[PDB]
Amino acid sequence: MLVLGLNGNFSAADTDVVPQLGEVFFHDSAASLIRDGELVAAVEEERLNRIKKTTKFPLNAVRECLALAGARPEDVDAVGYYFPENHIDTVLNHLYTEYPRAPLRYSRELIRQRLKEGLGWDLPDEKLVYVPHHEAHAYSSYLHSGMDSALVLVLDGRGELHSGTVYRAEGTRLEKLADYPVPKSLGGLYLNATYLLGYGFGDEYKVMGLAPWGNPETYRDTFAKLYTLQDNGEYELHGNIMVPNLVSPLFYAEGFRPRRKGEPFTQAHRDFAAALQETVEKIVLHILEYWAKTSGHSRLCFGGGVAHNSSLNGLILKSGLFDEVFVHPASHDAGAGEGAAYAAAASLGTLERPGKRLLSASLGPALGGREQIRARLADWAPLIDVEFPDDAVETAAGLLAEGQVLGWAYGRSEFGPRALGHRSIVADARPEENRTRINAMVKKREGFRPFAPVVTAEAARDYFDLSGADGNHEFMSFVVPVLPERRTELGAVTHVDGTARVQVVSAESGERFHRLVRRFGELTGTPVLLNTSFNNNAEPIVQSLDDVVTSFLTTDLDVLVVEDCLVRGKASPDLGVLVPRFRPVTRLVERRTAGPDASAGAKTHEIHLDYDGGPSAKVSPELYELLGAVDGTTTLGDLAKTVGGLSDALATEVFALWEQRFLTLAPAGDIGPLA
Amino acid sequence: MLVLGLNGNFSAADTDVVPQLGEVFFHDSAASLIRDGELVAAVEEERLNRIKKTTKFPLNAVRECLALAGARPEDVDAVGYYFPENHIDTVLNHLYTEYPRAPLRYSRELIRQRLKEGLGWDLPDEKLVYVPHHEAHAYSSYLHSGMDSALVLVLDGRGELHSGTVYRAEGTRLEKLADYPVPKSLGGLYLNATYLLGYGFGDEYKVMGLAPWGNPETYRDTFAKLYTLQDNGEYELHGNIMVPNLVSPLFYAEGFRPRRKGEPFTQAHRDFAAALQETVEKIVLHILEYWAKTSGHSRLCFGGGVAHNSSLNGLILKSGLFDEVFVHPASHDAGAGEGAAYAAAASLGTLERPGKRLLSASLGPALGGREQIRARLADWAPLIDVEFPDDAVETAAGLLAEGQVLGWAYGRSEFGPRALGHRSIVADARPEENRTRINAMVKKREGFRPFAPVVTAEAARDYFDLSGADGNHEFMSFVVPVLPERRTELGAVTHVDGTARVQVVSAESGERFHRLVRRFGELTGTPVLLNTSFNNNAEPIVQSLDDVVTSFLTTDLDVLVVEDCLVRGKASPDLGVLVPRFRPVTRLVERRTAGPDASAGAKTHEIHLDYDGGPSAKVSPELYELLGAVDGTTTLGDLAKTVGGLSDALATEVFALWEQRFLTLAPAGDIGPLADDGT
Ligand SMILES: NC(=O)OP(=O)(O)OC[C@H]1O[C@@H](n2cnc3c(N)ncnc32)[C@H](O)[C@@H]1O
Numbered sequence A: 001m002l003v004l005g006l007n008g009n010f011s012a013a014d015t016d017v018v019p020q021l022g023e024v025f026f027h028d029s030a031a032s033l034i035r036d037g038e039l040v041a042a043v044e045e046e047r048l049n050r051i052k053k054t055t056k057f058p059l060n061a062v063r064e065c066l067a068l069a070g071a072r073p074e075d076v077d078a079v080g081y082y083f084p085e086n087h088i089d090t091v092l093n094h095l096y097t098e099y100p101r102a103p104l105r106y107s108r109e110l111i112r113q114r115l116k117e118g119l120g121w122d123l124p125d126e127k128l129v130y131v132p133h134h135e136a137h138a139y140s141s142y143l144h145s146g147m148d149s150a151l152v153l154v155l156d157g158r159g160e161l162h163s164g165t166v167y168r169a170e171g172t173r174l175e176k177l178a179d180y181p182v183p184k185s186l187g188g189l190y191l192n193a194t195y196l197l198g199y200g201f202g203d204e205y206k207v208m209g210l211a212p213w214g215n216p217e218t219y220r221d222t223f224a225k226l227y228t229l230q231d232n233g234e235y236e237l238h239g240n241i242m243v244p245n246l247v248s249p250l251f252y253a254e255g256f257r258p259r260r261k262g263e264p265f266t267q268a269h270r271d272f273a274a275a276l277q278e279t280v281e282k283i284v285l286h287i288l289e290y291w292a293k294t295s296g297h298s299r300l301c302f303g304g305g306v307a308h309n310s311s312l313n314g315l316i317l318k319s320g321l322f323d324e325v326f327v328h329p330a331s332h333d334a335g336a337g338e339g340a341a342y343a344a345a346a347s348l349g350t351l352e353r354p355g356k357r358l359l360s361a362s363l364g365p366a367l368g369g370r371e372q373i374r375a376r377l378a379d380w381a382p383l384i385d386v387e388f389p390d391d392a393v394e395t396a397a398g399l400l401a402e403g404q405v406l407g408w409a410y411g412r413s414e415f416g417p418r419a420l421g422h423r424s425i426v427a428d429a430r431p432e433e434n435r436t437r438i439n440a441m442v443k444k445r446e447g448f449r450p451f452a453p454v455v456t457a458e459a460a461r462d463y464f465d466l467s468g469a470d471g472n473h474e475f476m477s478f479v480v481p482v483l484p485e486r487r488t489e490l491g492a493v494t495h496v497d498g499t500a501r502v503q504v505v506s507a508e509s510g511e512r513f514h515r516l517v518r519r520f521g522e523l524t525g526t527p528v529l530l531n532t533s534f535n536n537n538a539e540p541i542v543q544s545l546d547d548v549v550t551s552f553l554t555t556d557l558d559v560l561v562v563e564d565c566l567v568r569g570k571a572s573p574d575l576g577v578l579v580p581r582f583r584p585v586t587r588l589v590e591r592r593t594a595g596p597d598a599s600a601g602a603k604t605h606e607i608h609l610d611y612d613g614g615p616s617a618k619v620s621p622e623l624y625e626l627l628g629a630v631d632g633t634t635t636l637g638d639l640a641k642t643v644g645g646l647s648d649a650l651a652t653e654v655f656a657l658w659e660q661r662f663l664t665l666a667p668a669g670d671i672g673p674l675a
Numbered sequence B: 001m002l003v004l005g006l007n008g009n010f011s012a013a014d015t016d017v018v019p020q021l022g023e024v025f026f027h028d029s030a031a032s033l034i035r036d037g038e039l040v041a042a043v044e045e046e047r048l049n050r051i052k053k054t055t056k057f058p059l060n061a062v063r064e065c066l067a068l069a070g071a072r073p074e075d076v077d078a079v080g081y082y083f084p085e086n087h088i089d090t091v092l093n094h095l096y097t098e099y100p101r102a103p104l105r106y107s108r109e110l111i112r113q114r115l116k117e118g119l120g121w122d123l124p125d126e127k128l129v130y131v132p133h134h135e136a137h138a139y140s141s142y143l144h145s146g147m148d149s150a151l152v153l154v155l156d157g158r159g160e161l162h163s164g165t166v167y168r169a170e171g172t173r174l175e176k177l178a179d180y181p182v183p184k185s186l187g188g189l190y191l192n193a194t195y196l197l198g199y200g201f202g203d204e205y206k207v208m209g210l211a212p213w214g215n216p217e218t219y220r221d222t223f224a225k226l227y228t229l230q231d232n233g234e235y236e237l238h239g240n241i242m243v244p245n246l247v248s249p250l251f252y253a254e255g256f257r258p259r260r261k262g263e264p265f266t267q268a269h270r271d272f273a274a275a276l277q278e279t280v281e282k283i284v285l286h287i288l289e290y291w292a293k294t295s296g297h298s299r300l301c302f303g304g305g306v307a308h309n310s311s312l313n314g315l316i317l318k319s320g321l322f323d324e325v326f327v328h329p330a331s332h333d334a335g336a337g338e339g340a341a342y343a344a345a346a347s348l349g350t351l352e353r354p355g356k357r358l359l360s361a362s363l364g365p366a367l368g369g370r371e372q373i374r375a376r377l378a379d380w381a382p383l384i385d386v387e388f389p390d391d392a393v394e395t396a397a398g399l400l401a402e403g404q405v406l407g408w409a410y411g412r413s414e415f416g417p418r419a420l421g422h423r424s425i426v427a428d429a430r431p432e433e434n435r436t437r438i439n440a441m442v443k444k445r446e447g448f449r450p451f452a453p454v455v456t457a458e459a460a461r462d463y464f465d466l467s468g469a470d471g472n473h474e475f476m477s478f479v480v481p482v483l484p485e486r487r488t489e490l491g492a493v494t495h496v497d498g499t500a501r502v503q504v505v506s507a508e509s510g511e512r513f514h515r516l517v518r519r520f521g522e523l524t525g526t527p528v529l530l531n532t533s534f535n536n537n538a539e540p541i542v543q544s545l546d547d548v549v550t551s552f553l554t555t556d557l558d559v560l561v562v563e564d565c566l567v568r569g570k571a572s573p574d575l576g577v578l579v580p581r582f583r584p585v586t587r588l589v590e591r592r593t594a595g596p597d598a599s600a601g602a603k604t605h606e607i608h609l610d611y612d613g614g615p616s617a618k619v620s621p622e623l624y625e626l627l628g629a630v631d632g633t634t635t636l637g638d639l640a641k642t643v644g645g646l647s648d649a650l651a652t653e654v655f656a657l658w659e660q661r662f663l664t665l666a667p668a669g670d671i672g673p674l675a676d677d678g679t
């Protein structure tokens, strides 16, 4: 029994189903593969097309999943899609009314067209199963918990008819207990409010990181006008008729002004964040307090995109409402895609479930075999120096103890948004200055942002307060208190409120990463590391060896540990040997607007990425000419001869575009099919 | 007391307040000027920036209105804006949360900035008055009716808080009797349905033209699921949580297929339009039957954008409910901008009202003085031949009797969407072939709609069943039956159900145009003309002389009558003497997309108009190089020297871009400041 789970929209690599398809129209595309009830492979399409939270059809992810399972398309017994057919088709039909040139292709036709054109796979109609959206979430969250009965709560922005659903799970059967309508959405509430802070879709966890810097009393009575807690686990959100945003009109009337890009986060902004976070904590705990005592369950599985609110989860853990809580590493819609595989399997026969609680999210493609990795690192030789230590883990522990910030890339990539020891950036957790600098210089992000620690399972209760319910900490699902007597020791990873979104690593969840942290603790006395995701501000978590090396070279990391090779940047790297390539969404434009006296204005030149919310940057006339000659095979140095050789100012301009990922720059060739 | 009324959004000429600001965010921008209670000038900004139903700040409209009144900006005593300040600022604030780079500028500061920078006018805060949206509508509709009191109904998409409002008006006082909430919007219902027909905002009038071709029984029971009529003039529209469109989910579930671009209308499409039109009629007559009985009033004024549904108006007229009905020529948001001026006057002092019922919509800028008009037509000489007949009207009527299709441009442009004898295209109303013929001449694809007839007041009741109430017909507000015995005679202007959107012209409403239609009737025996707006498919109604000549030269009209001059195009017009100028929204682009094997891919050259819904067209590498050299003064022929001369192929390419109005092409210089004609 081999079953594919699918989620996302249906756009091709280089175009969208309608032009500029909004970024929230079926986002976080992914593919998962289950075999005999076990999750054998899963990867988000963002890792492969390099578009964060992409809506494009997860073609590459399907291909990578099949290869990891050693399967052909013809081996797949069924395909589950994470929404009902009538809902996604009605939304497609709506887009087609707004875009009268788009042909009327609905989801079944588009899914089959993508699989046939992109994988040579003719999917028969009877093998495609559409699934209620919150049922898909619930299966994914519950079946990986290792529990044999539980309360299951799903809270997201919306499914087809509901923003929240409550289930009883027993054995492999789900029984719906209750639901909450779409206008009561807590995901929608959090996203509406996120927009007041100059942020957008995907930035909610940044708002969450901002909340502890604020005082929730300032705007508590304002948010109190937007919701009412009612008897027996009910609540209401109070909408308005002015604009499609629950939050902005009231806050505007009280004189709150939305933050602008590039402007500081004021104390009013921080206080706004703190009151928002308190509001959805109050509502969710109200829901759970009622359904815990009503359902009788002592164990909770929590899923849906709202379950990535690590602060909320930590509060649930400390609430005393449950004995055990489980949260999946991919509780957003990528996890619903996996749940749609289990639901499709259930619709066609008995359902097989995982045998054990999931401990590792290392489920994506790996980096390659040892031979091809070493060969590809040799292609990068004009840029990097490579060393092959006898014991890379021992060597990396020492570099960390000496204050180096390390890129760390091993085996299969993490499913879901957290880095957990396979595509990580790691540093000494003790100095508070590491937080200041890794925010400012490495990740190039806001100074208020916290950093998450990883601790060995054996030392976890020496540093963190895990009391209350038994939660699963393998995936940084829970914010927990750092013990007061350890807060000054753990300066880089203790948040302003004394908490940490902790990863507890064990020999079973991540043997190699556990050894790294254990050895570091033997050398320093502190078995705790800072662990942030391996990506710059312009990209999702790195996937391939080329992604890893590109990110290392365009961030300010000290050294890269990749499959036991230590990589350092050459003193003077030769950018000239790199072969530029367009991404499928890369565009180059020479533009004139109107000028004075209704003339044609002066020409300007720009590169941009062609998707909703994609970046753009001005380029010089010289680089515009250079980039127009890109062929995918010719090196940057040779291309540059048509404009008088790779200038130092030209190399610098190209390097800035590379850092922003407007194009692909990498040595000729590629690593080949992954061994 | 000189009061300016404003409506629309706040964008400058060349950018929008947020990029690609949606075409529905405070559209049909306009400026109106009232003086001691009289409307002295009004024009929609679309006529001046040439963007249909534009949302941009009506700066040109304000400048033109002040010039017509002989006023400085500093002479204005108050400015009224057609929405409450908190509502428009909350919408702007919402736009600013979606675009975090936009500076936080709200409506008061933006109004003051545009007026300061555009006119040197420092508007004091106390002179700016913000007005309830449906109140602005009601004042404009009622104060121009000539009525001593009336029931006043406003239906549109939405105001700040309602989609419909009912008032009793008396003297200059308005008293609100009822309202209907935003989600019950009939303007919203109609526009939602319009999208299923492959159309968009501003195409509702086309859907209404299509409805008579359809059988309303096909989808009657489907639409019945979307509304319920209730007691006491109430009704409900049944929404859905699937998508922000009331109509598409249920029709999708029943197998309906939204029409695609360039696809012809199926019978299903025709029937859909017919059931939609029936639906809105049933609901509006349900509202009006209750409020006529409850108010006891025998007179109705009807405004808001829904009041441009002239088939509905015609059915209101034929209902037994009222003795008089009045509809303003600009019942859409441009007229709310007017009504905001009245409300501001009532607020900050006493409200003076118009002396008489409005008979003419000739209220925008004129074409110019007789001498600058002849001076300017001389600049066009390499393209046209001009005659100066003794009596242009007499000549025009003869040409019309011979079968010619004329452009007709006189005086001040019409306020509101209908051409009424000042920016019109006129032809014999009798030949049914003229429908297909004239649609081809202006390159429009609305052969399924008949054109609208204009008739003299004296003959009106010889041709049209005006019975029922007394409606005002000076603005084509009512669809009325064409008398059976006259239907085959009026072949170009009679619809498949026997109806027509009639303009009745009188010596009082438009002296010149009345004389023209009268004279034509003396020569032919039929004192009825076809009258359609003077614009091709790519522009609003022409405004200036240059607009008029440009439109004449880019359509296949036989002859142009403009201010007593007879204009015809030369055989072989010399396009090279035209000076190209970018419009503020013109963009010229060379583009590379991604190619196979991750190469830099297909290279293309394009021109487009940078606004939501703006057109675009491919251009050749040679024309790209020529257009990039446009300086606003050098002629097309001289610019073309830099790429080898103006070849027949290049001139053909440019002409097609001219037809689509991607740039301005006209002789060097301009007509100069419009002459103070002494009126
Ligand atoms: N079907 C569907 O809606 O997709 P989905 O399961 O992937 O969840 C997305 C929703 O989670 C909300 N969300 C994401 N992170 C969140 C956070 N830290 N706190 C609250 N809500 C959050 C987000 O704002 C958005 O409303």
Ligand SMILES: NC(=O)OP(=O)(O)OC[C@H]1O[C@@H](n2cnc3c(N)ncnc32)[C@H](O)[C@@H]1O
Residues within 6 Å of the ligand: B028, B155, B156, B157, B158, B159, B186, B187, B188, B190, B191, B204, B205, B208, B304, B305, B306, B307, B308, B309, B310, B331, B332, B333, B334
């Ligand atoms: N504030 C505000 O909403 O603007 P507004 O007063 O200018 O009216 C616009 C509304 O009239 C509706 N509308 C326009 N023409 C229409 C027609 N022939 N039939 C029905 N509705 C129409 C149109 O679909 C739109 O919903």
Ligand SMILES: [Fe+3]
Residues within 6 Å of the ligand: A133, A137, A156, A157, A158, A159, A304, A305, A332, A333, A336
């Ligand atoms: Fe979801």
Ligand SMILES: [Fe+3]
Residues within 6 Å of the ligand: B133, B137, B156, B157, B158, B159, B304, B305, B332, B333, B336
């Ligand atoms: Fe309106």
